[PDB]
Design an enzyme around this catalytic site. Structure first.
Site, PDB file in Angstrom:
ATOM      1  CB  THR A 116      35.478  46.081  42.198  1.00  0.00           C
ATOM      2  OG1 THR A 116      36.753  46.593  42.613  1.00  0.00           O
ATOM      3  CG2 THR A 116      35.020  46.543  41.033  1.00  0.00           C
ATOM      4  CE  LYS A 119      34.490  44.746  35.363  1.00  0.00           C
ATOM      5  NZ  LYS A 119      35.622  45.477  34.688  1.00  0.00           N
ATOM      6  CG  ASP A 121      37.700  39.199  37.758  1.00  0.00           C
ATOM      7  OD1 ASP A 121      36.674  39.299  37.215  1.00  0.00           O
ATOM      8  OD2 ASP A 121      37.799  39.523  39.145  1.00  0.00           O
ATOM      9  NE  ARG A 122      41.264  43.722  36.653  1.00  0.00           N
ATOM     10  CZ  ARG A 122      40.661  43.220  35.132  1.00  0.00           C
ATOM     11  NH1 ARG A 122      41.469  42.537  34.573  1.00  0.00           N
ATOM     12  NH2 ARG A 122      39.609  43.892  34.767  1.00  0.00           N
ATOM     13  CB  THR A 123      37.057  41.104  42.075  1.00  0.00           C
ATOM     14  OG1 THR A 123      36.923  42.563  42.184  1.00  0.00           O
ATOM     15  CG2 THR A 123      36.380  40.435  43.316  1.00  0.00           C
ATOM     16  CB  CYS A 166      41.241  49.159  36.240  1.00  0.00           C
ATOM     17  SG  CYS A 166      40.783  48.020  37.211  1.00  0.00           S
ATOM     18  CG  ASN A 167      38.995  53.317  40.746  1.00  0.00           C
ATOM     19  OD1 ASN A 167      38.200  53.288  39.687  1.00  0.00           O
ATOM     20  ND2 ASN A 167      39.363  54.322  41.317  1.00  0.00           N
ATOM     21  CB  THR A 168      40.010  46.647  41.005  1.00  0.00           C
ATOM     22  OG1 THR A 168      38.487  47.263  40.997  1.00  0.00           O
ATOM     23  CG2 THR A 168      40.049  45.420  41.819  1.00  0.00           C
ATOM     24  CB  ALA A 169      44.491  47.692  38.038  1.00  0.00           C
ATOM     25  CB  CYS A 184      33.599  50.573  39.887  1.00  0.00           C
ATOM     26  SG  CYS A 184      33.874  49.522  38.292  1.00  0.00           S
TER      27      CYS A 184
END
Ligand SMILES: [Cl-]
Ligand SMILES: [Cl-]
Ligand SMILES: [Cl-]
Lengths: 240, 232
Positions: free
Chosen positions: B124, B163, B48-50, B83-86, B193
């Site tokens: 996110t 998700k 999980d990125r967050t 994935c933006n967070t990635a 996101c």
């Protein structure tokens, strides 16, 4: 530090791209049909959507260039990438299934067997929506006979329209495709189909949203293959 | 030499399937054989990125790196990440990658109408907290509006509900937050996101302002890259 290889992860390859829409739909169904608490509990998948594979019906009916060499190439690509099981979201391409299975290291699961198994036993007379080549080469015929099933194919005029619906979808107009397909469905029902196999992986996309209005169960070949792949994935000691 | 595009996906899997669909939808093709060649890694075990970024959880990087190389080795000449967070790790990967990489951040900002100065951002917590879009938006002359903390918690909740599989639930959570942003003056809203477009699907016309789809923005940019070679 330590990374588990994809093979050890029981990674599933999808040998797709026939056509691309159908392949995206399978991916969507892998998410819907897998119970997962979060991202990390979903099935590991590698996908080949490389559409340059020659048209299957052109090859089979017209003696056009054969897809087989491409299938073999991308199958090997998936295997090399770590796929331990391979699925093909194209019914028509199962003409080559046995040939591919000869060269495959990975386990391969037939869309044909998976689809037939998902038909209620009580449905004896079953419509078949498929490409001309799938019908012409009798891919479902042998297996259906073994299950004691009678397939109802559209008449020549109707099949021409089913085929047109499939390619209108492949060309990207769903609304037009629907207008073509829906009447053929009703014809099959009118003719006594107790269920209808959607035997071309584009058909579920066309039917989507209208199923509630269709008077018999539609059997989704793409979903059937996904369910079968999930069962394979979940049969491992580290899976359950 | 076929200009194959790899998709480094799986974060999460629904957003990845969504990207594939858009590749089909956004490419003009007379038939199957004229669609973009794609190799997709959807191998969701990436941490999980967050949780990593905010919570000190395990780092996704070595996973990203592994699947990056896997795609290159299968022959992807260009790599995209839905994935933006990635994108916290984008530069790092870009530095180890032989294949071309296209950032979801730039592509998405590039698709905002010039007339929209005040732009809402749905993303996110890690994407907001690490400021992935902030320095880029600032340079473009953009002013980002994000939900107030209470609202952001609900956005995060919507994202994870999607998700987890319930779209209807996710919508109930997300919709009011979109309305709040509009009430605060957002001229457009970045869906920042890649699960957001999936939640919003079907209600877009019901929303006053334009929604900017980061996933779609990346696909268009990738298609442009693909169509940019002498043989394509
Ligand atoms: Cl098919
Ligand atoms: Cl086609
Ligand atoms: Cl994201």
């Amino acid at each position: 530090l330590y990374f588990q290889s994809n093979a050890m992860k029981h990674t599933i390859g999808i040998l797709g791209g026939m056509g691309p829409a159908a392949t995206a739909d399978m991916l969507e169904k892998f998410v819907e049909l897998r119970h997962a608490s979060c991202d990390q509990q979903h099935i590991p998948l590698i996908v080949s959507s490389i559409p340059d594979i020659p048209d299957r019906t052109a090859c089979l009916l017209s003696g056009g260039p054969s897809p087989y060499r491409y299938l073999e190439r991308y199958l090997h690509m998936l295997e090399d990438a770590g796929a331990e099981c391979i699925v093909i979201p194209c019914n028509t391409a199962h003409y080559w299934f046995d040939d591919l299975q000869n060269v495959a290291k990975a386990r391969m699961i037939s869309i044909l067997d998976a689809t037939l198994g998902d038909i209620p036993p009580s449905a004896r007379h079953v419509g078949l929506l498929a490409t001309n080549a799938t019908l012409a080469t009798g891919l479902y015929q042998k297996k259906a006979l073994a299950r004691g099933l009678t397939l109802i194919q559209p008449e020549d005029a109707g099949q021409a329209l089913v085929m047109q619906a499939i390619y209108t979808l492949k060309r990207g107009d769903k609304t037009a495709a629907q207008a073509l397909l829906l009447p053929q469905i009703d014809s099959l029902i009118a003719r006594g189909a107790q269920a209808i196999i959607m035997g071309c992986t584009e058909i579920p996309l066309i039917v989507a949203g209208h199923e509630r209005a269709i008077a018999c169960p539609m059997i989704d070949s793409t979903a059937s293959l996904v369910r079968a792949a999930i069962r394979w994935y979940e049969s491992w000691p580290d899976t359950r």
